[PDB]
Symmetry: C4
Subunit: 354 residues, 4 copies
């Protein structure tokens, strides 16, 4: 009776196979494309979350080569102000800038918020990010058309989706990039609360093969725990990666440092948690992540993982990485061997914890 | 030598794939059918357990649109009295009522208890629930025929079964619904103690495809830990769901509140545990579940999960949900990504715990 | 390069499917056959281990319908004495006795110990049990022939083996039963220490299909954690089951009661552990098991599980059980649903712990 | 879109099947070949790590029949000195010696260090070990040719690799043995940090079938937790095994004993950890391993496992072991049965811990 279409695997089910290599990790190029008209010098985007990205985080992401998306849990006026501070802000040679030398910045919108879009455009946002829980819906697709009718030349990302049929529908409505991720987020409970989702490695795979038909890049959003997950998302064919938890414990994220039982924390929470929505049925939780320092130093570790990986595969840039990469499927016992095992860590590494 | 018929999967092995959607979670209809002659406004039934359902729980389930089944661990006179209080009991627009405006109520019976059935009918029970450990047996089938010979027009549910062959035999004996579940219950030890059972998602699938041949609905009984499990049971083709643990910690359940080490609990126990049967060989245990409050607020969270799910699938009602739903099979690493991960929860959600 | 012959499953990978049933658990017959010439009234044998079986344990096993095997970690004279006390020992209607009314008893031997065999025969042991770490070897097979040349009419069990090729070789040498189990024991480390073994459910399956060709029954030895494991071993086609850990915490086992941190224990240890062999390379460990009481009450729980199971399958006796049984293969998530889950046990059951 | 070439299994996914045996564990021969021109009396090599091997460890490995590789985290002069002390150093009948009676010793080199190679050769190292993170690279292959052009008769091992294509390229460049292992090490984080690696049992299998075409032996490097893992690596077709963690807690390893919370430890760390490299992106961690005593006693336990295993398979020497061995694939439940289970260890074994 039940129709089961696929056995689906996430990040910790696969490994990249090494290949012949004449590249060194320090020599590879990691520039990529955010949208079909905007490129990144580095493939990372901080997530559109009121405990991750605001102007200070967005400034550093762009200075470092990526992008930050200003969350929408604020009044239009404040979000316009946050955009204007990124755009009116060297030692940052790889900085991502628009045609006039100003740093690039993205902002989030929701369905039926044209007024917000009019104000964000006047402030000069580079890309607007149209977030829903369910991207493959009449409300989202109708909003993509309304925005494209009024602002044909504004870059518009739509999400989130997890199927080839969803990618085709958002691409046909004329978006400039698709965000993939139903359920994988650290703070997300959608898959438990509603039963719905597609494990991320399979979701990216399905959506990349469909979107490539339209020349539309795919943003892998959610479920990154380690730098190797970035390498794998990019290698499957995604063009960039959105990070929440890994950036939430930085200096630049909103919220202050606190210490609890001898460890330092910042708070981090789902945009569909009770606290962020202040009866309601949430699909996120509120919690804490360990303080990790500046964004620059987290980013440096993350890209060092990416560069290391592309060295092992022998790829000179991201699309060579994508054409060269072959994976293997691993077992639970395989995962445990990959991690640290049979040794007690006494000096924690800056890129591998607990 | 050994004959292995199937690899069988439970709830945490699958996810629902999202599909195109023009529905909103608040707009879907969740009315369904309890038996081939009785419908529910909501698909939940509280379980026939002396720590879950008695008159106060059964009143609220029906007021809210479902049903409560009065357990049989009591003398006939007391069970008749509990039935009469539900039926002699607005702000509850979706209340489930019989033709005369009285709330609907079910009661449990066992094999060879005609006298109990005669008294429950005089009190006007809507549906009697014939519980055994092994529904696919000569004793159960012979009892189904005896009751149907004397009370052709009384709705009769029989269980529990876990195979297509069992569903066909209870449907041929002329039951009005079949209860599926050998082993999956929270407090159940049958699968460990006797080696016998079928994982629940596979058991429902096998029994729905057989019972649909007779027009007989299937009640998914046991193993619901989260609201998403409800969505999946309904999507595989079951028509309603029986809940024990999730309701056992409510105000309306029998038993009083107690506090232990700073947390509030109510007790909950198997009907085949030593304590409930007071040498004996049990197939259940006695334990405690956290206090969760009123039934109305648990139910509100549970259905919010169901509604959310049907939104993601794009279904306007339960049978559209059933025809639209396609699943994926997931791995252990996939399950861990679905849950909250790499974050420490600090503000517990009302629908997702530990 | 590597040759992989089979994916192999143990007990916790399968469940018995229920079938139509006209039997009740109290009505089934559980008599079986120990060797091709000796029958048991119950299918349990206590293991030949110096912390499990000695005369008091062997007396109770036989009184209850099974057998105890006197371990060989003692001088010939003492083992003869222990045998003579079982045979010179109602309220035990199902007692297992020889032709003269004396209780049946088995003893263990090793390779090249004819003298021990001569003395055990004079004392009237019913069956000698020829234990090795590796039954499928020239030493074991040559010993089986030497014993059968001198004592054609003495029942002789040989083990342990885990392959069809091993069963054929011990059956061709003319044993009367084969013991299956490399590695599965609770206290065993062979599979970790040497890399060698076959998971038990697959090992029994392979060896039963081969031994049935000779009319030789198979004893499932090791890896029983719960009564359901017994049901499954018998259902795959094994004729009886050897138990170590589950009996080691009884009154009748050798060793005294002790209390540690408020719990009662008896000690239990591998016959290939350092302590039992008193540089050496062990394949067992020394430890403790919770005190569980009399053998009669453990046995009563174990057989209640067996009887319950045969009720669910609809089998009137063990061979009907074997011909009726169909299994399903389950997942990790399936195993967790079978166990108690989402509830905290507060009153431990007599047949299901931690 | 994604290309998945293989489902890959590590050590804890397989078991060796027993076969007919006329060997006893004490009678088997475990001599093997380190390189196509150098043999070992025992198949173990201590790893080239500044917390495992220096002159005292290398002396004992060779005295016992294997080899130690002097790590390169030191100035050329010191490494030359450490080599000279091994070679200027009975009760050790199986000692591994060169043609003149001096103990054999290996040393590690890196890319572009000809000067180090010139000095190590003058000191009379038997084999140089060319370590990289990525053996299948232009830098490694070009170094193999430079060394072979200047020192045709010097034995040269190159690693690490994890694919058949890598083995073919290092064999074509004319190495004398290949080291297999990307990621499996106890202290290694490469697979998490970069996403790259092949589970070890599959990696050895792929590389042995390719290298055998050239007559080049394969060294299984990393991921050994128990003696059974050695047996399995050798049985798949590897010719020798490199050990880090299991030897790091010995007397002979560099570093002193310390006690922490009542247990004795020595420290052990990745060669790609921050501490060993003293911004940097590590692929190893720093930690501690329990003190286990002399190397002789660890080695005695390890080989006792190997000998035990070859007894169960019925193999007289390593290549008979390789031609006889057939495996089975096991489940998670199978792994748990293999370990100690349902018993609390109270007297720890010298070859099986926690
Ligand atoms: C990132 C997530 C998950 C998220 C973010 C903020 C809020 C939510 C809340 C409200 C908890 N959850 C939903 O809206 N869930 C849902 C589910 C199905 C449909 Cl069709 C739907 O319709 C779209 C809309 O209403 O915009 C919505 C979730
Ligand atoms: C929900 C369960 C599991 C359950 C509820 C209350 C009691 C039981 C006890 C008694 C522990 N367990 C059994 O009766 N177990 C069993 C097993 C096989 C057969 Cl055929 C059987 O025959 C039917 C009958 O006897 O009504 C019965 C169990
Ligand atoms: C139940 C087990 C496992 C067991 C019981 C008591 C002792 C052992 C010790 C000695 C630890 N282990 C062995 O003998 N192991 C072994 C392994 C292979 C062969 Cl061929 C072999 O040859 C037979 C013999 O020697 O009788 C033996 C083990
Ligand atoms: C045993 C390991 C893993 C290891 C040992 C010492 C250091 C490292 C550090 C530096 C952390 N990691 C790397 O060099 N990683 C890497 C990754 C890819 C390539 Cl192509 C590469 O190029 C070769 C070279 O540079 O010699 C290197 C690792
Ligand atoms: O409340 C929520 N429910 C579900 N997903 C969320 C919620 N809040 C944020 N997300 C998504 O989760 C991602 C962050 O996941 P993370 O990188 O694993 O921490 C964000 O990019 C969002 O797409
Ligand atoms: O003692 C028992 N043994 C086995 N199943 C039981 C027992 N008591 C109740 N059940 C079943 O378990 C279900 C509750 O499971 P739960 O929803 O997971 O807590 C009830 O609907 C009963 O069908
Ligand atoms: O030292 C040992 N190594 C391996 N197996 C053992 C050892 N001692 C006893 N056994 C076996 O393990 C069985 C008991 O396993 P258990 O029932 O799981 O506790 C006995 O029947 C023996 O066949
Ligand atoms: O920093 C590192 N990263 C990755 N692998 C390492 C590192 N240091 C040592 N190794 C490898 O790990 C092996 C030891 O692994 P182990 O035997 O599991 O402890 C050594 O033989 C090296 O090949
Ligand atoms: K590792
Ligand atoms: K999640
Ligand atoms: K259960
Ligand atoms: K074991």
């Amino acid at each position: 009776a039940m129709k089961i279409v696929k056995r689906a695997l996430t990040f910790e089910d696969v490994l990249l196979r090494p290949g012949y290599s004449e590249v060194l990790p320090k020599e590879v190029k990691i520039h990529t494309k955010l949208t079909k008209n905007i490129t990144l010098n580095m493939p990372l985007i901080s997530a559109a979350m009121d405990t991750v990205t605001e102007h200070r985080a967005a400034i550093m992401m762009a200075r470092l080569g990526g992008l930050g998306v200003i969350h929408k849990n604020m009044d239009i006026a404040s979000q316009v102000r946050e955009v204007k501070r990124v755009k009116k802000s060297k030692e940052y040679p790889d900085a991502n800038k628009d045609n006039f030398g100003r740093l690039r910045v993205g902002a989030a919108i929701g369905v039926g918020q044209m007024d917000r879009v009019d104000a964000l455009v006047e402030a000069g946002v580079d890309v607007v990010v149209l977030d829903s829980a369910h991207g493959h819906s009449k409300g989202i697709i109708d909003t993509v058309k309304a925005i494209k009718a009024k602002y044909p030349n504004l870059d518009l990302i739509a999400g989130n989706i997890a199927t080839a049929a969803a990618a085709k529908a958002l691409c046909e409505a004329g978006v400039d990039a698709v965000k993939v991720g139903i359920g994988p987020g650290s703070i997300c409970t959608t898959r438990i609360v509603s039963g719905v989702g597609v494990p991320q490695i399979s979701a990216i795979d399905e959506c990349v093969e469909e979107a490539n038909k339209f020349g539309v890049p795919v943003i892998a959003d959610g479920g990154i725990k380690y730098s190797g997950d970035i390498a794998k998302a990019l290698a499957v064919g995604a063009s960039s990666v959105m990070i929440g938890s890994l950036l939430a414990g930085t200096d630049e994220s909103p919220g202050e440092l606190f210490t609890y039982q001898g460890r330092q924390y910042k708070s981090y929470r789902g945009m569909g948690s009770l606290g962020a929505m202040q009866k309601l049925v949430p699909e996120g939780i509120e919690g804490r992540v360990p303080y990790v320092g500046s964004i620059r130093s987290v980013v440096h570790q993350l890209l060092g993982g990416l560069r290391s990986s592309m060295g092992y595969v022998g790829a000179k840039d991201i699309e060579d990485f994508q054409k060269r990469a072959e994976f293997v499927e691993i077992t639970t016992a395989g995962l445990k061997e990959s991690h640290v095992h049979d040794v007690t860590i006494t000096h924690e590494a800056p890129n591998y914890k607990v």
